[PDB]
Symmetry: D2
Subunit: 212 residues, 4 copies
């Protein structure tokens, strides 16, 4: 059940990346997962907004470089909406531990967006830890409850179809985005190291290479 | 500041539509908005899933038939992810009243997705009411706080561009969806009555007509 | 329906008193209530802990100097448990707006304890505002729902009896507390100004005077 | 670190006792604790309100029959306020898992009150489980963070003193309560079985015996 998980954070919450990466590495690493911290590591790092996060999630998930994305922003809204526009990226909100469990069972998506500022106060790091505990333990997509899994599974499958239909082909779509945005998205050493090491889709690798 | 607002709910939460429509009509109607209840009205109504909800939100928002969509499902996740894939549909989560305020100020989107089952217990209707109070009172897109509105406004604008770039043209995209899904989405009398009365985009009207 | 409301905060959250008093004065003042800020006003003010808060709530409520107490601490737990030990002080938690409404209708108590650190992040002041909006608007003790008010009202009445039975008489009890604690509790100018101006119970006034 | 834990629920939430006892037995039992279900087991059981719950918590905690109480009601407010009036009973609210952890570290009390109706919807049992996981794993009273434990520990100690001072002696206080209430509180077979088997304070046992 082990996955490659990419953590990616943007400028408004970058000061908190060390804390979140700490919890993710502790929890998900302890559970046997392979964790990559590909967004901002602090406020002085290669600058990103929640727009770049969505593009990064698409490139990493669609190229199969990673299996799951952890992201977020002050409220999680920008990052969640920025991820979900991309085909192949199915991102839920995650505000408290049972969100993560239900998301995995009902939606069986591949990204979650946390709120790192709103609702995040003294002792907020505990909730992040507990979210990771429930997100990355156990099996995924069994429905909840297990007996009612059929229509949930059916609709989750259809969601992927609709996303693929409404969207251009992945690379064509990326080419239509302002290329300044995409260049910025793939610009950091930590992003490139993850992507190039694990990309399973040559067309995406070649496209990314052409930007650098 | 008055808008046309469409409420749209799917089968799992359809029993609760009367309650939610009640609160929406009371709150938003009292504030001078024009409310349309275009999804399921009860469990026996024209059957919809959260997949159809997203298609309905796209058709109504992109045709300018309505200005804002209220939707949701058991956790809000399926409906939120189903809406956000569509160009022109910018849907936030909304779980408690300050979510609605912040969404309007920071993201300035045009749809919210509520959780009608998870976290919804005895006295849940109060929270729905209060959410509507904050969603539909006052101005939108001023940033929060007001002084920091610049980058938030800039990123919200870019989000729309990226959505438009990654997605096919609206009608082409709708044609690529399984047409059974789209026919179902536009199938009800309450949907058609809202759409045909208020659609401002002939190409969409003609496409919808061709399905009926 | 107008009341005298005392806001009282302790050292760990004292930096936030200006914000909370601001919202309370704005909301409750606008609704015609008389607001007193009797706890710490900032970190440098006459020093209090959540222990002193409970004693202050007892003296002000039992002397009828005020009708309602707003208090809290990092999580609200210490202040809530410190208030509830005292006869005549019925303090609920209040974390989000519908808590305040339900508390007023079901429990019909006279104090609420907020969390000013845990769960309090960027945009936390909005939730405080909204809590005050629901706490101090409308009528109290009607049950919720209104039709089921009978057993709720009966039990709320009994709670007061049990508190009065288990506790010593008010003044005797205050005399049994470490008198250093009580002297500290009544020590500030803002506390004394409220108490002495509005106390309706001479025995309590005389006892308080004897400490000063 | 093993404790004796009493679960006690009242009439409004009695239908949910099987679920809660299930989770408590699973979680706390698995962690080596000894669990007693001493309140209502279903809607037809020996009838209790949240008033009786507080009296039961006092008798069981003050007699040292148990180490910890799990209780609650629709919102948790009545049960929390009913417990906290009694000397020797230090009851926090518990609505989500990190509440339980912080309560144990900061307040180091001996009871928690959950909300079984408000905020409790589809998937609510997961949150109950997770709450028990955090309440009953690990050590208690270390402060949070650990480095800042001194004033938190000092104030928690003082809280006990103030409670003991304001309250009559335990048995005298129980005698002052309407004795119908106390007779009802100790009336069930499941309560008596726990109490008489584990009571370490003869005066309390003799008093309880005199009611039966």
């Amino acid at each position: 059940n082990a996955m490659k998980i990419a953590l990616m954070m943007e400028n408004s919450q970058a000061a908190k990346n060390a804390m979140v990466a700490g919890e993710l590495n502790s929890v998900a690493g302890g559970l046997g997962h392979d964790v990559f911290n590909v967004g901002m590591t602090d406020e002085n790092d290669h600058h990103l907004t929640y727009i770049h996060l969505g593009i990064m999630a698409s490139i990493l998930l669609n190229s199969k470089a990673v299996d799951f994305v952890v992201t977020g922003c002050g409220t999680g809204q920008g990052a969640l909406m920025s991820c979900n526009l991309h085909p192949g990226v199915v991102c839920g909100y995650c505000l408290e531990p049972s969100d993560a469990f239900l998301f995995n069972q009902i939606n069986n998506g591949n990204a979650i967006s946390l709120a790192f500022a709103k609702g995040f106060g003294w002792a907020g790091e505990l909730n992040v830890r507990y979210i990771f505990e429930k997100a990355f333990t156990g099996k995924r997509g069994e429905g909840y409850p297990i007996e009612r899994a059929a229509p949930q599974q059916a609709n989750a499958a259809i969601l992927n179809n609709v996303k693929a239909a409404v969207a251009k082909d992945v690379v064509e779509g990326l080419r239509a985005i302002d290329q300044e945005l995409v260049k910025t998205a793939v610009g950091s050493t930590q992003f490139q190291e993850c992507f190039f090491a694990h990309c399973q889709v040559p067309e995406i690798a070649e496209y990314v290479k052409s930007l650098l």
